[PDB]
Design a protein around this ligand. Structure first.
Ligand SMILES: *[C@@H]1O[C@H](CO)[C@@H](O[C@@H]2O[C@H](CO)[C@@H](O[C@@H]3O[C@H](CO[C@H]4O[C@H](CO)[C@@H](O)[C@H](O)[C@@H]4O)[C@@H](O)[C@H](O[C@H]4O[C@H](CO)[C@@H](O)[C@H](O)[C@@H]4O)[C@@H]3O)[C@H](O)[C@H]2NC(C)=O)[C@H](O)[C@H]1NC(C)=O
Ligand SMILES: *[C@@H]1O[C@H](CO)[C@@H](O[C@@H]2O[C@H](CO)[C@@H](O[C@@H]3O[C@H](CO[C@H]4O[C@H](CO)[C@@H](O)[C@H](O)[C@@H]4O)[C@@H](O)[C@H](O[C@H]4O[C@H](CO)[C@@H](O)[C@H](O)[C@@H]4O)[C@@H]3O)[C@H](O)[C@H]2NC(C)=O)[C@H](O)[C@H]1NC(C)=O
Ligand SMILES: *[C@@H]1O[C@H](CO)[C@@H](O[C@@H]2O[C@H](CO)[C@@H](O[C@@H]3O[C@H](CO[C@H]4O[C@H](CO)[C@@H](O)[C@H](O)[C@@H]4O)[C@@H](O)[C@H](O[C@H]4O[C@H](CO)[C@@H](O)[C@H](O)[C@@H]4O)[C@@H]3O)[C@H](O)[C@H]2NC(C)=O)[C@H](O)[C@H]1NC(C)=O
Ligand SMILES: *[C@@H]1O[C@H](CO)[C@@H](O[C@@H]2O[C@H](CO)[C@@H](O[C@@H]3O[C@H](CO[C@H]4O[C@H](CO)[C@@H](O)[C@H](O)[C@@H]4O)[C@@H](O)[C@H](O[C@H]4O[C@H](CO)[C@@H](O)[C@H](O)[C@@H]4O)[C@@H]3O)[C@H](O)[C@H]2NC(C)=O)[C@H](O)[C@H]1NC(C)=O
Ligand SMILES: *[C@@H]1O[C@H](CO)[C@@H](O[C@@H]2O[C@H](CO)[C@@H](O[C@@H]3O[C@H](CO[C@H]4O[C@H](CO)[C@@H](O)[C@H](O)[C@@H]4O)[C@@H](O)[C@H](O[C@H]4O[C@H](CO)[C@@H](O)[C@H](O)[C@@H]4O)[C@@H]3O)[C@H](O)[C@H]2NC(C)=O)[C@H](O)[C@H]1NC(C)=O
Ligand SMILES: *[C@@H]1O[C@H](CO)[C@@H](O[C@@H]2O[C@H](CO)[C@@H](O[C@@H]3O[C@H](CO[C@H]4O[C@H](CO)[C@@H](O)[C@H](O)[C@@H]4O)[C@@H](O)[C@H](O[C@H]4O[C@H](CO)[C@@H](O)[C@H](O)[C@@H]4O)[C@@H]3O)[C@H](O)[C@H]2NC(C)=O)[C@H](O)[C@H]1NC(C)=O
Ligand SMILES: *[C@@H]1O[C@H](CO)[C@@H](O[C@@H]2O[C@H](CO)[C@@H](O)[C@H](O)[C@H]2NC(C)=O)[C@H](O)[C@H]1NC(C)=O
Ligand SMILES: *[C@@H]1O[C@H](CO)[C@@H](O[C@@H]2O[C@H](CO)[C@@H](O)[C@H](O)[C@H]2NC(C)=O)[C@H](O)[C@H]1NC(C)=O
Ligand SMILES: *[C@@H]1O[C@H](CO)[C@@H](O[C@@H]2O[C@H](CO)[C@@H](O)[C@H](O)[C@H]2NC(C)=O)[C@H](O)[C@H]1NC(C)=O
Ligand SMILES: *[C@@H]1O[C@H](CO)[C@@H](O)[C@H](O)[C@H]1NC(C)=O
Ligand SMILES: *[C@@H]1O[C@H](CO)[C@@H](O)[C@H](O)[C@H]1NC(C)=O
Ligand SMILES: *[C@@H]1O[C@H](CO)[C@@H](O)[C@H](O)[C@H]1NC(C)=O
Ligand SMILES: *[C@@H]1O[C@H](CO)[C@@H](O)[C@H](O)[C@H]1NC(C)=O
Ligand SMILES: *[C@@H]1O[C@H](CO)[C@@H](O)[C@H](O)[C@H]1NC(C)=O
Ligand SMILES: *[C@@H]1O[C@H](CO)[C@@H](O)[C@H](O)[C@H]1NC(C)=O
Lengths: 222, 106, 122, 90, 136, 90, 222, 90, 222
């Protein structure tokens, strides 16, 4: 019961199942295409603080995947490495054949800890995590992915690092990592470009920790 | 069926001098050709196979070459008992045809 | 390695069936990758290939003799044989037993028997 | 028949896909280099219509996956080709 | 038939280093299809002391060392030049000794087929010994 | 054309199969709950005929599996659809 | 060469391969169905003592599986955990994607030891072990399964525990477990309901071991 | 339309393939014994033509495999059957 | 874009994609066949010294496989067990379902060490390694394989052991193993039959090591 789009010299139509269109010729299987599109193209927020609120954990439901033949370049991809407070892993290792998404502009790598209630992390809106040419219902550990959806039809990076605490819950906190001992408090009003600009002025000017302590920066509210 | 053609029908040579024989295929035989020495009263003796490899027990004075449709057998210097009928055989098709036999003479 | 020895009646009459049996020794028939074959001498002329039987018992015959030739085989005794029907004087020849191989290394190396002379006359 | 009801739409697509000794895995490119690329614009409303289509096909796809047992499904489009033929020549 | 001859010795000061060599012939090449080679030393008035040995490449090409030279001496080979070397670092005057190369080789039985050699886990062939003097 | 030759037959079938936010894996049911259920009776001899069919198809299926190398076969019915079409429109 | 049943408004027919039936219309792939049926519907004995005599071990033959789309509820499912006398395992762990049969009335869980001659346990009559929606030629360790067969066609729990000794051989023995130290000798004349009734009267009346020894019951022969 | 351009050709094929209680995995043969065997000769140039075909199809097959993500592909011929049908009855 | 051969009562033709042949009837999927052919049938050298020069190592490229339905008997199959100089493995273990090639005449088993530059060993000419009924782009550890190619169309052992040093490089050396302490220098002019004949005369005549040393033989140059 999965719909197919049909591309005409008019517009994009959705193929029926009850109505047979005699002129909708299919000459080969090469005219059928699976396309992975990103959610960012619909205006969903992409900052880390808001993104992680769309994900959550559950048990009793197995993971599954489907393939793509083509897809979009992502401006914002994510890569998670989350551990439980006791040091154990939250996310499963990716299985053979799963590789990261090939075309990301900024990768938001989040490392940290938090409660992990289930077996797997699932998307709450039912969107898929997009891996190289495979969409998945779950997040795999250490693998870069984009969020998105898959269409079927008839045809005729800069790496930004963050630390996280309380990753799997509602009230969580994040830091932007400049150096091993240098961090900036993260806010939802920051864009990837903003963070890169802060990394250049702080690092270049030497406003970094010299002692063994952690230097934590807070952006002026204005 | 591949017709094999040999030439000359008769090849007189003085003892001590070498001699060569030709064999032509109607269609390519890749390397799949053999040469045999025939004397009265005996089964033919294999000399060369795969157009160039010596059969066990064959003297170094015998040598062959060729591919496709053009094959040859060379005796570098004929000795006694090198005067015989020499046949070519192709084993690339299944009619397993043969040439006519060239008569090497003194 | 494998010795081949032909035997048969020697002299047969026109319109009789000629039966030549080749004994296989120093090997066996179900050897995997070999063809068991027969060749006719035509005295004074070059050779004519007659046909083969596979190690699996499957056969093929030279079309010129397809209607006159039966090749069969018995693996319990290690013999194979040629049955040539409706003989005539034209079939006088030395008949030879030979083995051929499908293996690449041995692809061009035949094993020939001694050869048996058959005379056909009234 | 597709009405895009999303808050906003990126009208264009920046896409990637996978289309002498180069063909030999030993001498050919590493995986990061096997992709091609290009842009498409919203010709006659196609891109925003396509984004809405992908948003609608999601429910059917998730229910499908719940029902099946394959760990990885590569056969959705082969099934579509077969049904296409059965509906016309059954 | 196998012979190996030592060189590269003489007087070196303590605290320094030197590299000895032993070049041979009569074998089948000393890198592959061959016995590994050892160094043994004998100070005048003392018995022989094992230093270590380099295995042949077919046996892995590693070096097994005697405890007294660990972390100071290195046994290595110049492959296909049939030459054995000993690099002695952190020299002390206690290292004055005659340094010998030694080989587990010699010819084996022949056949109408071909020739043969044996490679052993003990020594049949000793070199002459090169004297190394370490002094102030 | 099916003659049930079994010692006995259960004439009926008690069966299970797999047919707002419910569609989302995150909010939907756990695997034990994704199945439906119901009963069928032996209408016109269908159930006992079906049990005999499954008993006869077993030999063909085991020989098939011996020959193949897939660890898991999900494609038997897709092959059947293709042969159906080739026999009619080849 | 696998037969298909065809369901008509007459009866169930077996489709030929040589005869083409022009009226046997197939409109979509959704009319094709894989059905898993249980062996118990044919009257095969289901008690543990008789069931295990239909199974055995072999080596040199790999395991394989096929899928179901639908199937029967089982009255009697089995779950094995069998070890060799030296403590090692007899059965392989189930691979990803294999889950127990979803609809069992009584599960007969058998734990114990015995000789295990081969690599895998296979069905001797050629029947399949039925797992969630996958039939298999072999038994997986710790996974609940039904015995059965698979049909292809065109369409238009209480957990009872047992101990076992000598599991893989011809002469074996079984005990019904009431408690850690309380057992009843098992017989082929006992039904699942019988065993449940014995478990209630024994447990409820306190006729169970109090000391550290094992109390072994033997049913009156009548 | 096939021109064999190889240095040499083995004109014949020695091949293997996979075609009461014997059908039961428990009683049937071990894997080394499930194969059949026989010989074929170069009837009408077929074997050398076939060797050349396999040499030419290699490039297309390797590029195909580069593009796909299946770890094991068992579906090349099913796709061919589907395209055959679509080209005639599309 | 993979070509199909078509077998006629004339000859073997290559099917087009642009030209439809109305008489090229396909009655079932059983007329389609995948055939694995060996490279030795084209005259490629098969001795170990030359064979290994066609193989090499690379990283960044994943392995993939395809199936066969039928194939050739091989005269020469290979089986590698190669380690790095530090004792670690060069080749990956074969995954489930990969089995050795079923019909080999001589198996050349090569054990040894050498540099292994990549992750996997790949064929340099693009040929496939043929495993039971699966062609692969890579070599698996300990598994017997033939080298070859795969055709698609419409239809109507003695074990010889070698030691190796420097296996993955250009300048390497090999020995033929007669016994644990007895070896013969290997040359490209030796055939499998030659090696077997040497093994019989050496072993039968007792010209083998008696002491704990290795006896290394060198064939007379003539
Ligand atoms: C296809 O396209 C449609 C249309 O764009 C998308 O529809 C979106 O659906 C999601 C829900 O799946 C909407 O997201 C938010 O849902 C919240 C309700 O859930 C909360 O509470 C439950 C418990 O009761 C929790 O389980 C759950 O996790 C949540 O915590 C609303 O409360 C949200 O509204 C508030 O926040 C937003 C923040 O952006 C504000 O703008 C609102 O004014 C309000 O304060 C919110 O509705 C989402 O909004 C829907 N989009 C639109 C445009 O309406 C489909 O999801 C999409 N499908 C796919 C696969 O992409
Ligand atoms: C915040 O801002 C800082 C300042 O710019 C960024 O720091 C730079 O990060 C990049 C990317 O990691 C570094 O680039 C690469 O560094 C490699 C390691 O070099 C080390 O050793 C050399 C001495 O040998 C030192 O000079 C150097 O500082 C390092 O300590 C180099 O090997 C790389 O060169 C090679 O690879 C590249 C491809 O990757 C090729 O193009 C080159 O030709 C060459 O083959 C390369 O230089 C860069 O050095 C860092 N600079 C400094 C001053 O630290 C942070 O990444 C940024 N953070 C965020 C989130 O934006
Ligand atoms: C499809 O439907 C048919 C019909 O119902 C089923 O046929 C059954 O086939 C099995 C055998 O596969 C029959 O079972 C028994 O076979 C025994 C013979 O094998 C024994 O000896 C060999 C060694 O020689 C061992 O390898 C083997 O493991 C056994 O130990 C017979 O001796 C049995 O008969 C005795 O026991 C039974 C117990 O119930 C008594 O009733 C008998 O009177 C007798 O004392 C027995 O025959 C089975 O009986 C067949 N069924 C029927 C009704 O005849 C197919 O198996 C089924 N296919 C599938 C996949 O389900
Ligand atoms: C032979 O006969 C005996 C006697 O009836 C059976 O024993 C009962 O077995 C059932 C199933 O295992 C037990 O039911 C569940 O026990 C759980 C554990 O409770 C323990 O701790 C409490 C104190 O907190 C004690 O009172 C109790 O006896 C245990 O020691 C409970 O947590 C379960 O309740 C929860 O889950 C169920 C769903 O499973 C929900 O419906 C409930 O609302 C709740 O959320 C539940 O009670 C039962 O307690 C055992 N009874 C006794 C007396 O031991 C044997 O199983 C039976 N054997 C066979 C083969 O038939
Ligand atoms: C389908 O059929 C065709 C025709 O038979 C086959 O074509 C063969 O292709 C291979 C190359 O893929 C040829 O092999 C040799 O290539 C060497 C060049 O590469 C070297 O140098 C590069 C770096 O520049 C390295 O990366 C590489 O690894 C090599 O080291 C040539 O130099 C070779 O020629 C020399 O050696 C040969 C040894 O046999 C001598 O005969 C030559 O005279 C010369 O001294 C060589 O050409 C191979 O020769 C081609 N075959 C033929 C008959 O020409 C396809 O490979 C085949 N496809 C499949 C899948 O099987
Ligand atoms: C170089 O040449 C030598 C000399 O011929 C070969 O050595 C022979 O190798 C074969 C194959 O491995 C050996 O055959 C088998 O040996 C098994 C082990 O037997 C050992 O113990 C007995 C005493 O109980 C000793 O006599 C024997 O020498 C061994 O030490 C036997 O169990 C086998 O028999 C069983 O299995 C076979 C099927 O494999 C059945 O056919 C039998 O009926 C039986 O059930 C079998 O005998 C052979 O013994 C070795 N001979 C010698 C003298 O060592 C080298 O393999 C060869 N190398 C190369 C590369 O060609
Ligand atoms: C995260 O969820 C928890 C519940 O699990 C929220 O905690 C409750 O908050 C309400 C106020 O809205 C209090 O009246 C309850 O007493 C709290 N319960 C507990 C157990 O603490 C928490 O407020 C949520 N946090 C965020 C940021 O949404
Ligand atoms: C289980 O199988 C064994 C054989 O492996 C049977 O043992 C034989 O039984 C016969 C009597 O029928 C005796 O004559 C033999 O001497 C026994 N052989 C051995 C090695 O002990 C055993 O009887 C079978 N048990 C059951 C219950 O069937
Ligand atoms: C194996 O490859 C190496 C290079 O990696 C070759 O080494 C070079 O050989 C040339 C002569 O052709 C010398 O001029 C260079 O100085 C060598 N380079 C190094 C780093 O040693 C080597 O000769 C090749 N061996 C074989 C047998 O082909
Ligand atoms: C951060 O850690 C890395 C090692 O992972 C080290 O190379 C680098 O110098 C460290 N930076 C600081 C400021 O300590
Ligand atoms: C680190 O920098 C601050 C600000 O310039 C300075 O006061 C402090 O003494 C420095 N610490 C060290 C260890 O140099
Ligand atoms: C049986 O063992 C369990 C632990 O696995 C324990 O909780 C229970 O009390 C034990 N019962 C008896 C009678 O010892
Ligand atoms: C267990 O019960 C029996 C029967 O009532 C009784 O004789 C025995 O003394 C009891 N054992 C213990 C330890 O109480
Ligand atoms: C070689 O090793 C095997 C054990 O792997 C031993 O059985 C055999 O006797 C050994 N042969 C020699 C000559 O040491
Ligand atoms: C090994 O054989 C050789 C040649 O016969 C002989 O000289 C040598 O002494 C033998 N070694 C032993 C330990 O018997």
């Amino acid at each position: 019961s999965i719909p197919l789009g049909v591309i005409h010299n008019s517009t994009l139509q959705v193929s029926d199942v009850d109505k047979l269109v005699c002129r909708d010729k299919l000459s080969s299987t090469n005219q059928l295409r699976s396309v992975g599109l990103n959610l960012e193209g619909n205006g969903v927020a992409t900052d880390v603080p808001s993104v992680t609120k769309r994900w959550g954990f559950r048990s009793g439901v197995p993971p599954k995947v489907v393939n793509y033949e083509a897809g979009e370049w992502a401006e914002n991809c994510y890569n998670l490495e989350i551990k439980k407070p006791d040091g154990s892993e939250c996310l499963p290792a990716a299985p053979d054949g799963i590789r990261g998404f090939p075309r990301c502009r900024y990768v938001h790598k989040v490392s940290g800890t938090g409660p992990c209630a289930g077996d797997f992390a699932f998307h709450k809106e039912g969107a898929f995590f997009l891996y190289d040419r495979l969409a998945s219902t779950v997040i795999y550990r250490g693998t870069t992915f984009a969020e998105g959806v898959v269409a079927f039809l008839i045809l005729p990076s800069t790496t930004i690092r963050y630390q996280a605490t309380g990753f799997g819950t509602n009230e969580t906190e994040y830091l932007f990592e400049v150096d091993n001992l240098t961090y900036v408090q993260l806010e939802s009003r920051f864009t990837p470009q903003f963070l890169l600009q802060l990394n250049e002025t702080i690092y270049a000017s030497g406003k970094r920790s010299n002692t063994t302590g952690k230097l934590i920066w807070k952006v002026n509210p204005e | 069926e591949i017709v094999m053609t040999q030439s000359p029908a008769t090849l007189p040579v003085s003892p001590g001098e070498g001699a060569t024989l030709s064999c032509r295929a109607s269609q390519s035989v890749f390397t799949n050709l053999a040469w045999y020495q025939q004397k009265p009263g005996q089964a033919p003796r294999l000399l060369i196979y795969d157009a160039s490899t010596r059969a066990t027990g064959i003297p170094a004075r015998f040598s062959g070459s060729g591919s496709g449709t053009e094959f040859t057998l060379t005796i570098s210097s004929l000795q006694s008992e090198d005067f015989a009928v020499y046949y070519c055989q192709q084993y690339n098709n299944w009619p397993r045809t043969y040439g006519q036999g060239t008569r090497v003479e003194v | 390695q494998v010795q081949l020895h032909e035997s048969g009646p020697g002299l047969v009459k026109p319109s009789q069936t000629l039966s030549l049996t080749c004994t296989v020794s120093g090997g066996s028939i179900n050897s995997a990758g070999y063809y068991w074959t027969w060749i006719r001498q035509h005295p004074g002329k070059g050779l004519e290939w007659i046909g083969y039987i596979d190690y699996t018992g499957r056969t093929y015959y030279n079309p010129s003799l397809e209607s006159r030739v039966i090749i069969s085989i018995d693996t319990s005794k290690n013999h194979f044989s040629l049955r040539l029907t409706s003989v005539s004087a034209a079939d006088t020849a030395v008949y030879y037993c030979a083995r051929e191989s499908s293996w690449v290394s041995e692809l061009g190396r035949d094993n020939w028997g001694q050869g048996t002379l058959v005379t056909v006359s009234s | 028949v597709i009405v895009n009801a999303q808050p906003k739409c990126n009208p264009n697509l920046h896409y990637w896909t996978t289309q002498g000794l180069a063909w030999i895995p030993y001498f050919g490119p590493a995986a990061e280099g096997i992709y091609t690329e290009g842009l498409m614009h919203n010709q006659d409303g196609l891109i925003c219509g396509l984004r809405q289509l992908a948003n609608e096909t999601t429910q059917a796809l998730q229910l499908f996956l719940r029902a099946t047992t394959e760990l990885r499904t590569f056969s959705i489009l082969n099934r579509k080709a077969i049904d296409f033929l059965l509906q016309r020549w059954g | 038939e196998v012979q190996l001859v030592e060189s590269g010795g003489g007087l070196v000061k303590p605290g320094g280093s030197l590299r000895l060599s032993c070049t041979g012939s009569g074998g089948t090449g000393f890198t592959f299809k061959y016995a590994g080679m050892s160094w043994v030393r004998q100070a005048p008035g003392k018995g022989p002391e094992w230093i270590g040995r380099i295995k042949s490449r077919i046996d892995g090409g590693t070096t097994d060392y005697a405890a007294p030279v660990k972390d100071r001496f290195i046994v290595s080979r110049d492959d296909s030049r049939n030459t054995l070397y000993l690099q002695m670092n952190s020299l002390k005057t206690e290292d004055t000794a005659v340094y010998y190369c030694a080989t587990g080789s010699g010819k084996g039985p022949s056949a109408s087929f071909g020739e043969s050699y044996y490679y052993y886990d003990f020594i049949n062939v000793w070199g002459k010994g090169t004297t190394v003097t370490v002094s102030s």
